[PDB]
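Reading a protein record of the kind used here takes little practice once its layout is understood. The fold follows as a row of integers, each naming the local backbone shape at the matching residue. With these conventions in mind, the following record can be read line by line:

_____
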Amino acid sequence: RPDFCLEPPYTGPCKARIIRYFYNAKAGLCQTFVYGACRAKRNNFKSAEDCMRTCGGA
């Protein structure tokens, strides 16, 4: 499994408020978090299927 999914999400600066998905190593799967719409990282999937299809595998 990748390590960018174990890290926390990145709301980043900006002022937008989108509900992106990220892998919660504490939950074992993915959850939704506030995205800044800019400077997104690997811990910011548009859908839970993209987050699980990327780091999913527990």
